[PDB]
Amino acid sequence: RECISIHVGQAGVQIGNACWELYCLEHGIQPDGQMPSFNTFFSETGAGKHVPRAVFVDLEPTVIDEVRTGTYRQLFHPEQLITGKEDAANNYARGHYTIGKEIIDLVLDRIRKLADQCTGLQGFSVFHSFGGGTGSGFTSLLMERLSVDYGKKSKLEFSIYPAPQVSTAVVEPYNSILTTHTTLEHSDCAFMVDNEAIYDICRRNLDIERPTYTNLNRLIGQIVSSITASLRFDGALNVDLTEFQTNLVPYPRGHFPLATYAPVISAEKAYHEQLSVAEITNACFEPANQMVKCDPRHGKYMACCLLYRGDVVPKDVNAAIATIKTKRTIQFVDWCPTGFKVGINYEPPTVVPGGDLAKVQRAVCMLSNTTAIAEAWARLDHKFDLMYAKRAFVHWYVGEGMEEGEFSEAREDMAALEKDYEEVGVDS
């Protein structure tokens, strides 16, 4: 019943920092590993120290060093903290090939070591970003190997969705297009969120006009914990990760369920307001709490999964579902009946001490696969096209051995993906 977390790149690792901090908060784990009390994620020592079963990869020493100098440096095993010396430079060509390919063997052997520590490997999940060099480059490299060795294990990916308006990486389209090509075909499911959309959540629901990544990742951590800690904890409907895959992936392509999370409420907003299960789920179908800037009303739904924490009575859930099925404007694709996975954990929602979110007594996470995602690809299509037509920055990949045909090909694979969304949109 075990799983492995993999943190690649800054985004992967810094999100991971929040994630493991939250898992410590879930059980009262001390920075040194001492836990007085979740062995699905952790491995126990004779001292009662538990080791989070995870791998941290950075090709630049700095971020891992940040871990190594922080409080959780005692928690993590030195072998889990893997670092190279040089970067990918925002570039798949080095991340996947030239540079990252050198260290990956080590990385894999640490993974395999942990796989041998697992007794019942259920699977794993990889945290990264769609635009970066290691964030997406190295990441796909890893998938190429992991899908061989662990072909039957859960291969869930979580990635930051490139913001349409702000991006620090000029060749991000190129990176992301190459990842599509290689991740679609290897991964089982990839989830993503938009930091821009999140900012809007922070300013509207948390009332914060100063979000940093350390805020943004707390919110992400919430979502992740709902599906990682609480799915291993007790509930009414205990849903596994393999079950998630078995209930969220409808086609052999990928699919890309997007996250939505409600409650996201400031402490003051929690006052004077009573949420019910149904009210929270109402919020879950509002564009306003959509974690990716993509309009839910534009597309049609294919999948939807609702996962519940704390004070949730199935009775209320059932009523809530009835209304979301019938009251809303949620259009859905023919193919699908509304079999929405309901996970119901008794495990209460948790809050980070010193965080922004209010203590809540119940909480709902929503995953959804909508046809509007093709528009996200359309965004990438043109951004890629523009660059590629001019061949701007192309020498930074070509010099590492990339082929122009390959890039065209990858775009075409994306186009095919868009076409399949088109297909799904056609009802039948």
Partner: protein, 426 residues
């Protein structure tokens, strides 16, 4: 992970005198060489620029080069000239005299072999080089002449390391050498294709800033080179210190170069205003972005709104929200969309470091690559042509063997950069 810096020419040597001063300030390193700081970070990433010698002595990883002992001596005579080891002073005897031919082609060429040997010794002393940086003047004999020669050999030895340089670009009003455009022309001919990137500093613009916004009436070159070092140090510290964004020099280079040949930069800096107004200033991200965008705060005598912007890098130092930075950069892109090039979506890129420059709460470095840069090339090329036809001082150069057809090709190459900026100006 480490960087080697080489200074050359009277300009380069005096700029470096301020640069290294600042770096040691950043890390709490005393003018005599030992570390007397007080922050963990101060020693933590010191490796990029210092070798710790026995006794907790830090040796700046740089070579000081000249062809006149007296300049070197004056550098050595001040604080921080004692931190440099004698082995980093490589110099000859008899000038160059601001003559490219002497510097590059003939006499200075002779010294370069000894310089390079020391370079090699340092390349071995490093664990892993990220790159090299050189400081020099474009119209100078050793600055550009000898310096260029060195660059071509270093690049040859290390194709895989970053090769950049910052250089003083002949200002429209103050040229010292009559053939300063000639030397510059020749350096373009050699440098552009033998470097990953070069920065364009105009002293005239700097003198305007120091009085225009800083309201100062006494600067010297040390005060203006302070501003230069602010931008240089701004770039590398982030790479050194913990931040939020993506703090790698190579990645910067990747994001700023859309085309193999067009790698010229316009540095700018914020905040950068007089003390009087400091009581009337507010410190916000938009405040820094206002100063960064404003052409008057550029250190290059160009005008980015005349040309088109190909790439923009905004580097931030100190605690800022990600949101605010993202939004303000977006706003900039939005409001100045008429200057940005349409081929690059979201042409403004950012980098964020959480360590502020000593004494400030926040700061930002503006790096741009516009088409406006071509105007400098045009001015030089034109001036060059006139001189070319007359052979002014070319007997000095041809006397040392420099051939006019090489110069002819150099002229073309200048014109080629302009035409390529036009090709992407659209």
């Amino acid at each position: 992970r480490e960087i080697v810096h080489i200074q050359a020419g009277q300009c380069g040597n005096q700029i470096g005198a301020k640069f290294w001063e600042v770096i040691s300030d950043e890390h709490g390193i005393d003018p005599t060489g030992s570390y007397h700081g007080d922050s963990d970070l101060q020693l933590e990433r010191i490796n990029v620029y210092y070798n710790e010698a026995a006794g907790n002595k830090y040796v700046p990883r740089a070579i000081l080069v000249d062809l006149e002992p007296g300049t070197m001596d004056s550098v050595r005579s001040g604080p921080f000239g004692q931190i440099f080891r004698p082995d980093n002073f490589v110099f000859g005897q008899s000038g160059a005299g601001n003559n490219w031919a002497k510097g590059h082609y003939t006499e200075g060429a002779e010294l370069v072999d000894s310089v390079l040997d020391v370079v090699r010794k340092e390349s071995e002393s490093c664990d892993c080089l990220q790159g090299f940086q050189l400081t020099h003047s474009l119209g100078g004999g050793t600055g550009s002449g000898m310096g260029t020669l060195l660059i071509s050999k270093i690049r040859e030895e290390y194709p895989d390391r970053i090769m950049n340089t910052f250089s003083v670009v002949p200002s429209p009003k103050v040229s010292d050498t009559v053939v300063e455009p000639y030397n510059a022309t020749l350096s373009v001919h050699q440098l552009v294709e033998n470097t990953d990137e070069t920065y364009c500093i105009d002293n005239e613009a700097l003198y305007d800033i120091c009085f225009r916004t800083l309201k100062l009436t006494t600067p010297t070159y040390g005060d203006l080179n302070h501003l230069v070092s602010a931008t240089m140090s701004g770039v590398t510290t982030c790479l050194r210190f913990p931040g939020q964004l993506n703090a790698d020099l190579r990645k910067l280079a990747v994001n700023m170069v859309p085309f193999p040949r067009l790698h010229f930069f316009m540095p700018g800096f914020a905040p950068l205003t007089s003390r009087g107004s400091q009581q009337y200033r507010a410190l916000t991200v938009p405040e820094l972005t206002q100063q960064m965008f404003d052409a008057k705060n550029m250190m290059a005598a160009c005008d980015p709104r005349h040309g088109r912007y190909l790439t923009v890098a905004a580097v931030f130092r100190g605690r800022m929200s990600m949101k605010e930075v993202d939004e303000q950069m977006l706003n900039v892109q939005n409001k100045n969309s008429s200057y940005f090039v349409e081929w690059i979506p979201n042409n403004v890129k950012t980098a964020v470091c959480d360590i502020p420059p000593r004494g400030l709460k926040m700061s930002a470095t503006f790096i741009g690559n516009s088409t406006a840069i071509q105007e400098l090339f045009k001015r030089i090329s034109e001036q060059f042509t006139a001189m070319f036809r007359r052979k002014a001082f070319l007997h000095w150069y041809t006397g040392e063997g420099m051939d006019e057809m090489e110069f002819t090709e150099a002229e073309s190459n200048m014109n080629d950069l302009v035409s390529e900026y036009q090709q992407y100006q659209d």
